[PDB]
Ligand binder design. Structure first.
Ligand SMILES: Nc1nc2c(ncn2[C@@H]2O[C@H](COP(=O)(O)CP(=O)(O)OP(=O)(O)O)[C@@H](O)[C@H]2O)c(=O)[nH]1
Ligand SMILES: [Mg+2]
Ligand SMILES: [Mg+2]
Ligand SMILES: [Zn+2]
Lengths: 708, 585, 63, 237, 21, 83, 226
RNA sequence: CUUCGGCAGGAGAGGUA
């Protein structure tokens, strides 16, 4: 789906397989968190279906023994002074010592400031001991989290389930056409993109000679030349688009390890999976009821959330007993207005717009000049632009399969915009479906006339215990607007622990809040009150993080201030264009005559047992009978119902289903004598019945389509 | 009503569209119309709007835990590829808008259409068939709006000042229109106490009896009321002949009003009233002003003193153990209680500090959502956490989610999130197997008669005498004596009979029996029915969803099973926000 | 035996029914669902199904 | 340009002082730009007249009873604040009310000086029962909108003048609702349903023709800037 | 740091990291 | 009654329709049988005259037979003998 | 008493794309509705001009690359959505761009036809090498609002035509402020201060006349009741 | 009135509510 999902697929530990547990045999003690997982397996990132607890992810600092046991690094403290020698310890060796914490008050010389320190003992218990027997120390915080979890700012303010959902949802984001970097993030987005491998990295130092959109040539210091090629519009395993774009000039000097070209979800070398949007937190007329989201129309006009999606189609020409098949534009007796985009060989032309039910490759097979017609048509609901064709032919020295003479692959691309029903999410467990798209002129706007981009409801925040989103909103507003703390007389007490180069910022700055050591609430409250004004000398957001808004439909100002800021929103790969389905009549199965299943083929919806219970409790006896016989198995009543609906007459009576007859045949085949009796014995034969089933309509009820 | 996309409607309604196309001379034969519909010609879209008119469809969401998991609606054509669903039907379906999907089915014959339009319509099924409590009622945002609107705040703008000397009354109004005109200019608030002269609103019982006495023909009779503008606005949404309420709309008050309307008015009136209530609540929720910021989550003022006192009280037990006197389990049982005390002192400090107009307090106190345990966890102290077994860890977490947990505090807190996500996926089988067995054991029970003419019955409690001299109502009488046919005359003090055999025990009957002094009455039950096959309609009694006697031909066993098995599967899936304190489902 | 076989333990129920030569009367909800009849509850019972409707004399005369 | 679909107005008389107008089909969005403007320019723009102050003989310090009448002073003020007066002068007129003996004082016995007209002459004001008297002096100014009571300007110059609130608008209640219509296959147009209730002194349809003139004269200031600058045009009828 | 051309992203951290990922 | 005008499926009100039958299950078969009779009359118009009569109430522009049947029931123009 | 002073508009220029208009004296309560009627008409219904389609030389679709250009055809399409154009005709008009050799392709190379002006003179379309050529043909039209792209099969066109989206609005930001003189004696009034900002295609004063005209044409469906 | 001629099973993995 994106670089993060691929990098997370590896570094993944599975408890199943040939020699491991099962999905119902496994109980409740193997799918739990153990005190010995600290620094080896992440306690947050795991599936939430029937695989919960049986799949995990390796931690950031862990490695594997030659024997196969996981190790984690510790920093040795001897005689009360913390050294810099690092020792890799397994669980067996770890449960013999006392291990201190990474946030201990070191006195800039190795000595603990406080005698009593917090340690981890053998049985997973935490106790206070004097600084005389402590012998190891954690190498850092975030040592116990994985690489997907270490990219959530303000993690310690979120509950465990919301953090789990956010970490799992970060890997379903689709690659956008622009991919700008976050305003407030962690320090993990730089190294998670280089190691993923979806960016181009210079291998030797040198001077760039010439740059284009297809290649880069770098001249080394010894006169050797090396050129790099870029992948343009390549299809991924899941149907997304992978692109690489150079980010260097024609005279720049590069070094070994410098990022030279970008990737799918990369911005200047850093991972970027979403966009920064202006957020207002308030209810609005019931359009954001129960996790729904209201969106602006500017996000559609300017293609803020747009994605390219490619699809591949294949066909083959195989040898038939009655003669081989061939590819040409000689479709037996068909109009010439449908064969206008096909070239000489009989394949569509590049740059052509295709709809649903259009010829892609023309092929004919000898039937029983025996010429039938079997051509590659575009599946239902699809449409795009043909972007590439690949042809492999036996004659032209090609290692084809056995009994094949030609294989063609056609690629079709589309540009999908954001619309109602698409799924959006943030990094803190927020998720919802677009309920409405509003015009720009009827959205709430600030005092200067700036409309908001997205409205979120306030009823879902407090009961779910994910308040890191509001903190991120406050810090995002502070970073976007810029700040400068007034330090004419000394330094304010709240800014004593702030580093330098954090006392003054410019608009559109980028900051980094690590996972467990970041911005405390005191510094956020301080920064919210020293913010640079806009183009005019006005301050829109007061010290509490709230702004006064106007109403875009009536014009009156809202009576109370509302929380405004900037948030990072991602587009998830659950789109409404790939979820809608409907059917009136189509293909049927062979043993039982019920409709097929699935969306790939026209398939029906299962009416299971519980729905039968509901319809029996309602008292509806005719609806149930019609659902279970005419619409599913009554092979004779289906065509009669179709003809009665078409001609406008009454719906006839149902008959008998086929599953009952199949059951009777199987029971007989088990050496059991089953028979249907009447009021006076005389077993009913149950044998078909001579029918005048002549088709006086001639229009395939549905099992097929229609040709002229 | 529901919203149906155009593509789904065109695919479902193909034969009807083809029939109408051939009829209207837009095509020559059936095959041409089939091709024309298949290729989506422009002339198709003119006839869909008239072939889908007044043709119901069935909507369903999985899992179907009870009878109201399928409902029938009237479709309308919308632009897009998503189905629009009414806010008030999301409680029966148990649906939220974060990725859910639903299925659509189309009745064909005349009997199926009549059943879908009469039996399964969404406007006829408002009450729950297990207890009779309403299901299509305002919740979440609408409750907040209706709670904000009907609230009296002292000292607001334009309040009634009962003064003398120079200004006679300063706040009395002549009609609601004058009050609205005053509120628009900015001279009055909708939550200030005033006096209005109302004409077309029924007075309460006492005021009606005091002024008019005989009959209050309200169309033109005038009376003076001391209330707020919001209460008048709310009462203008109820039926015409409903007396003035003059209360603050908590959730229970709204539930009581809806129950009374359902039990005393036709169903069309209730269906039309709930939509008006929804509209008004949605309008006022946005102007209530509820928002979440970081200066709204206030912290307990003195929490370091409390936690230092309990820490020095736990150091005693620590030293005692160390030296030696306390067995390990008794040190863990001492510590557990010291910390269960400190979490209650932080809990009671938080309720005292917090003002009564904070969005966080307002949302929970209005009955909209949430508990106070979550509020204490967010702003106070989380408390004690459980271990992978089920015991309590003697180390508590002293920090809230506003200050931020530490790394070990966060590690020892992930044990309770696995047990609560591994329940939804694993222990729902234990409830669905019980539901299947319950459904199969009881499927031949069907109402087959009207009266078996029996004398047997069971005896219910119906309150108890007290040594003081009063009568204490039974704690659970709504699920043991309400909606049951009386079996033997309830004679009082060897004399006048309060209720005769055959009466259905409602609220007035229970009140009369309690006032007279009858304690124990015997009713007609299902376990003593004399009919051979199935049950009879008099022994069963009243239908919970309908409000009248059960009909002949009703499948009561399925209803029973569904009503016993739905609550335990739903509660099994909601086992993380349960509040602790004891056990669970 | 149809309902019992469709509930649980199909093999044992079928063996016992075959040995004992059982007969099914088809008077239940599950059997009527399986074989394709109207269930004997609700609008499918004899009292409501066999109903006759005709216009009254005055309405027939007026129109 | 051209709107492509000219909008039309309708009227659906409900009573004799309450109507419901409909404007359709309004281009996407233009149902919310005309409704609150018509509402406000209907409830705060039409010129009318009303009683502004009263003077009851005998009530000077305690303002809670009038010797002779059975009501209070609040109910007299509330019964005189519901009089439908119409003036044609331009300076405060003064009328009088004089009745004696046990009898119901209606609004017909108000002797309007040449200039003012009382439209509701059967309205109740009081009922005397103890051979008493009700000498009432009124001041009937003219204006527009609703004006709260004007606190005594010449305070000590008034011995017993009680200021009252003045409802000057001839319209009492207006509501609006924007629905959705359909032209061709675009399910995106609008429908503005208005609802105007007035006093028995003007008609519901002369207000939607007295409020439409004052808006064409307020949006005509923006047109005078460049009277050749293009816009959207509808056409004729 | 440690990357030749990384963009400048100021950090709020208060501790020091002795080890590299 | 104390309600506004009904629209769509909700017309005619069901509480008024339920006072002419004994149960909710009789109305379904009542309306369905009347609708079938109306459809038979409509489809057998130009050919041999059949005994089936209808509609009694004047029909709309394009009304389905079920709505006509319900309006006929509400106006007390039919009679039924439950069996 | 009835006031007898009607309002008056007055412009207070501040820049070249910005202006401020003062409408006073307004009636107590009528300051926010006139501001929002003018903000809802200005930010939606003002006509303009925009580019509706392009045709590059050796290009047949947008998912490709040109030889010598450091950008793809999608970044050129995203850099050609910030062109400010003005037209004075009611018909498609075709412009041309022809640049070659080491240089940067700006928006001042498009040779405008007869009655088309290009305002933005220093934008950035692309950057070429010493083996790159760019030939483009743009089509400028007139309309209102935001119209999505028109597929090639709806106009019977060729294979090289790439239909782009067209945003015709010439206005950027609009806001208002309404003070109020609510004193005693009930002699109150209002004062609206509107602020219009444009996009160099028109002036802040020629857009308020268009809005005034649309609103003096729509609010005249009531006056005819007399 | 249209002659022949043209289809749909299992196993495993990962996800959504
Ligand atoms: N039968 C099953 N249903 C499931 C399963 N997983 C999810 N679900 C459905 O998803 C629903 C989960 O919804 P929620 O967790 O949000 C319950 P609720 O909205 O009331 O609580 P909040 O999240 O606090 O708002 C659950 O009720 C089911 O209807 C499953 O494994 N089996
Ligand atoms: Mg939910
Ligand atoms: Mg959900
Ligand atoms: Zn009985």
């Amino acid at each position: 789906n994106n670089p993060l999902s691929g990098l997370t697929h590896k570094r993944r530990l599975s408890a199943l397989g040939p020699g491991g547990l099962s999905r119902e045999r496994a109980g409740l003690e193997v799918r739990d968190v153990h005190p010995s997982h600290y620094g080896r397996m992440c306690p947050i990132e795991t599936p939430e279906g029937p695989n919960i607890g049986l799949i995990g992810s390796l931690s950031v600092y862990a490695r594997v023994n030659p024997f196969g046991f996981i190790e984690t690094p510790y920093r040795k403290v001897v005689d009360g002074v913390v050294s810099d020698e690092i020792v890799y310890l397994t669980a067996d060796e770890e449960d013999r010592h006392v291990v201190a914490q990474a946030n201990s008050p070191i006195d800039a010389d190795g000595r603990f400031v406080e005698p009593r320190v917090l340690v981890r003992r053998k049985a997973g218990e935490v106790e206070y001991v004097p600084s005389s027997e402590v012998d190891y120390m954690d190498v850092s915080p975030r040592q116990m989290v994985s690489v997907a979890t270490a990219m959530i700012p303000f993690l310690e303010h979120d509950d465990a389930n919301r953090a789990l959902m956010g970490a799992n949802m970060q890997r379903q984001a689709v690659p956008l056409v622009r991919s700008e970097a976050p305003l407030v993030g962690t320090g993990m987005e730089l190294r998670a993109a280089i190691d993923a491998g979806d960016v181009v990295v210079a291998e030797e130092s040198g001077v760039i000679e010439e740059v284009s959109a297809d290649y880069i040539t770098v001249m080394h210091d010894n006169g050797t030349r090396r050129t790099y090629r870029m992948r343009k519009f390549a299809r991924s395993n899941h149907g997304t688009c992978a692109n690489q774009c150079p980010i260097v000039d024609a005279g720049d000097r590069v070094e070994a390890g410098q990022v030279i070209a970008d990737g799918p979800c990369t911005d200047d070398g850093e991972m970027a999976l979403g966009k920064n949007l202006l957020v207002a937190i308030m209810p609005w007329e019931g359009h954001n009821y129960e996790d729904a989201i209201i969106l602006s129309n500017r996000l559609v006009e300017e293609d803020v959330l747009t994605s390219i999606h490619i699809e591949e189609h294949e066909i083959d020409a195989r040898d038939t007993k009655l003669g081989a098949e061939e590819i040409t534009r000689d479709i037996p007796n068909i109009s010439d207005e449908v064969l206008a985009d096909l070239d000489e060989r009989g394949i569509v032309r590049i740059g052509a717009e295709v709809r649903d039910g259009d010829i892609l490759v023309g092929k004919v097979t000898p039937k029983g000049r025996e010429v039938r017609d079997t051509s590659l048509k575009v599946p239902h609901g699809e449409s795009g632009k043909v972007i590439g064709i690949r042809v492999f032919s036996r004659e032209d020295e090609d290692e084809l399969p056995a009994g094949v003479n030609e294989l063609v692959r056609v690629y079709v691309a589309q540009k999908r915009k954001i619309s109602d029903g698409d799924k959006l999410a943030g990094r803190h467990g927020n998720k919802g479906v677009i309920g409405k798209i509003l015009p720009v002129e009827d959205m709430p706007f600030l005092a200067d006339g700036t409309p908001v981009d997205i409205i979120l409801n306030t009823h879902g925040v407090p009961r779910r215990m994910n308040i890191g989103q509001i903190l991120e909103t406050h810090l995002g507003w502070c970073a976007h607007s810029g700040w400068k703390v007034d330090a004419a007389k000394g330094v304010p007490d709240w800014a004593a622990r702030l580093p330098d180069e954090l006392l003054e910022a410019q608009p559109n700055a980028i900051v980094s809040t690590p996972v467990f050591d970041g911005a405390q609430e005191a510094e956020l409250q301080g920064l919210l009150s020293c913010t640079l004004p806009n183009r005019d000398g006005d301050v829109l957001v007061d010290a509490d993080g709230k702004a006064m808004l106007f109403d875009g439909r009536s014009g009156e100002p809202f009576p109370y201030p509302v929380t405004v800021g900037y948030m990072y929103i991602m587009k998830l790969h659950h789109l409404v264009d790939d979820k809608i389905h409907a059917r009136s009549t189509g293909p049927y199965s062979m043993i039982t005559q019920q409709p097929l299943g699935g969306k790939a083929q026209f398939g029906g919806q299962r009416f299971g047992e519980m729905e039968c219970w509901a319809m029996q409790a309602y008292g509806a006896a005719y609806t149930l009978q019609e659902l279970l016989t005419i619409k599913s198995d009554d092979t004779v009543g289906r065509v009669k119902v179709y003809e009665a609906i078409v001609k406008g007459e009454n719906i006839p009576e149902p008959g008998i289903p086929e599953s009952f007859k199949v059951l009777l045949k199987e029971l007989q085949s088990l050496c059991l004598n089953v028979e249907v009796l009447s009021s006076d014995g005389a077993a009913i034969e149950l044998r078909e019945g001579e029918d005048e089933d002549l088709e006086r309509a001639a229009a395939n009820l549905g099992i097929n389509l229609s040709r002229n | 009503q529901c919203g149906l996309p155009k593509l789904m409607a065109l695919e479902l309604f193909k034969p009807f569209v083809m029939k109408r196309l051939v009829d209207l001379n837009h095509a020559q034969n059936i095959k041409s119309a089939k091709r024309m519909v298949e290729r989506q010609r422009p002339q198709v879209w003119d006839v869909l709007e008239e072939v889908i008119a007044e043709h119901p469809v069935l909507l369903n969401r999985a899992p179907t835990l009870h009878r109201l998991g399928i409902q029938a609606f009237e479709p309308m054509l919308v632009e897009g590829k998503a189905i629009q669903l009414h806010p008030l039907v999301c409680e029966a379906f148990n649906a939220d808008f974060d990725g859910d999907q639903m299925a659509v089915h189309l009745p064909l014959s005349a009997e199926a259409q009549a059943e879908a339009r009469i039996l399964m319509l969404s406007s006829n099924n408002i009450l729950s068939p297990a207890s009779g409590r309403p299901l299509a009622m305002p919740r979440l945002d609408m409750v907040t709006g209706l709670y904000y609107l009907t609230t009296e705040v002292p000292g607001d703008t334009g309040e009634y000042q009962p003064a003398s000397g120079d200004h006679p009354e300063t706040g009395v109004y002549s009609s609601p229109a004058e009050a609205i005109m005053a509120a628009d200019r900015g001279v009055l608030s909708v939550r200030a106490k005033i006096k209005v002269r109302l004409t077309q609103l029924r007075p309460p019982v006492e005021i009606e009896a005091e002024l008019f006495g005989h009959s209050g023909w309200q169309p033109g009779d005038a009376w003076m009321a001391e209330t707020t503008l919001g209460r008048v606005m709310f009462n203008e949404l109820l039926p015409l002949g409903y007396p003035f309420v003059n209360k603050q709309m908590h959730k229970k008050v709204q539930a009581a009003i809806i129950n009374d309307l359902a039990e005393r008015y036709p169903m069309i009136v209730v269906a039309q009233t709930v939509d008006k209530l929804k509209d008004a609540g949605f309008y006022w929720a946005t102007r209530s002003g509820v928002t979440v910021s970081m200066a709204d989550v206030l912290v307990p003022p003195r929490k370091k003193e409390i936690l230092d006192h309990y820490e020095e009280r736990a150091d005693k037990v620590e030293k005692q153990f160390q030296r030696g006197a306390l067995n390990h389990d008794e040190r863990n049982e001492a510590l557990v209680e010291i910390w269960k005390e400190a979490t209650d002192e932080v809990g009671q400090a938080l309720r005292e500090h917090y003002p009564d107009d904070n969005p966080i307090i307002t949302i929970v106190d209005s009955g909209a959502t949430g508990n106070f345990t979550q509020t204490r966890t967010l702003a106070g102290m989380k408390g004690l956490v459980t271990n992978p077994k089920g015991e309590f860890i003697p180390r508590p977490v002293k920090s809230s989610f506003r200050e931020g947990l530490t790394v070990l505090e966060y590690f020892i807190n992930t044990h309770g999130a696995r047990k609560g996500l591994a329940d939804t996926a694993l222990r729902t089988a234990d409830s669905g197997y019980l539901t299947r067995r319950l459904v199969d054991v009881s499927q031949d029970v069907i109402v087959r008669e009207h009266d078996c003419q029996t004398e047997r019955g069971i005896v219910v409690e119906l309150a108890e005498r007290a040594p003081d001299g009063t009568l204490i109502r039974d704690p659970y009488i709504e699920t043991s004596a309400y909606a049951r046919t009386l079996g033997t005359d309830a004679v009082d003090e060897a004399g006048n009979v309060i209720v005769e055999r055959g009466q259905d025990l409602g609220d007035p009957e229970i009140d009369a029996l309690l006032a007279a002094g009858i304690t124990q009455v015997k009713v007609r039950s299902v376990l003593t029915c004399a009919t051979s096959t199935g049950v009879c309609a008099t022994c069963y009694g009243r239908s919970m969803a309908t409000g009248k006697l059960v009909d002949i031909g009703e499948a009561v066993g399925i209803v029973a099973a569904q009503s016993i098995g739905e609550p335990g599967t739903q509660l099994t899936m909601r086992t993380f926000h349960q509040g602790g304190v004891g056990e669970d489902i | 035996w149809l309902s019992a076989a469709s509930f649980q333990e199909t093999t044992r129920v079928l063996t016992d029914a075959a040995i004992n030569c059982r007969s099914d009367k088809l008077n239940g909800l599950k059997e009527n669902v399986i074989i394709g009849k109207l269930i004997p509850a609700g609008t499918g019972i004899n009292r409501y199904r066999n109903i006759a409707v005709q216009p009254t004399e005055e309405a027939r005369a007026a129109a | 340009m051209l709107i492509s679909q000219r909008p039309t107005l309708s009227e659906d008389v409900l009573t004799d002082n309450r109507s419901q107008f409909v404007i359709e089909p309004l281009e996407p969005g233009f149902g919310y730009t005309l409704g609150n403007s018509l509402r406000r320019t209907l409830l705060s723009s039409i010129p009318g007249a009303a009683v502004t102050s009263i003077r009851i003989d005998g009530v000077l310090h305690e303002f809670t009873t009038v010797p002779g009448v059975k009501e209070d002073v609040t109910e007299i003020i509330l019964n005189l604040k519901s009089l439908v007066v119409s003036s044609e002068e331009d300076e405060p007129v003064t009328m009088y009310l004089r009745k004696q003996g046990p009898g119901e004082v209606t609004a017909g016995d108000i002797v309007p000086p040449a200039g003012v007209t009382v439209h509701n002459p059967g309205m109740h004001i009081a009922t005397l029962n103890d051979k008493g008297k009700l000498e009432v002096e009124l001041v009937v100014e003219r204006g527009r909108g609703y004006v709260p009571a004007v606190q005594n300007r010449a305070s000590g110059a008034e011995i017993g003048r009680i200021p009252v609130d003045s409802i000057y608008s001839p319209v009492l209640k207006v509501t609006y609702k924007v629905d959705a219509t359909r032209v061709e296959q675009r399910t995106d147009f609008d429908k503005l349903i208005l609802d105007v209730e007035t006093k028995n002194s003007i008609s519901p349809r002369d207000a939607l023709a007295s409020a439409g003139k004052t808006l064409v004269e307020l949006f005509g200031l923006a047109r005078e800037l460049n009277v050749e600058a293009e816009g959207i045009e509808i056409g004729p009828s | 740091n440690s990357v030749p051309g990384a963009p400048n992203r100021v950090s709020f951290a208060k501790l020091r990291e002795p080890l590299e990922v | 009654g104390g309600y506004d005008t009904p629209l769509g499926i909700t017309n005619p009100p069901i509480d008024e329709l339920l006072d002419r039958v004994s149960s909710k299950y009789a109305l379904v078969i009542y309306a369905a049988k009347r609708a079938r009779q109306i459809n038979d009359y409509y489809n057998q118009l130009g050919e041999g005259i059949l005994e089936y009569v209808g509609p009694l109430v004047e029909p709309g522009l394009q009304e389905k037979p079920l709505s006509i049947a319900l309006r006929e029931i509400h106006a007390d123009l039919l009679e039924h003998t439950e069996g």
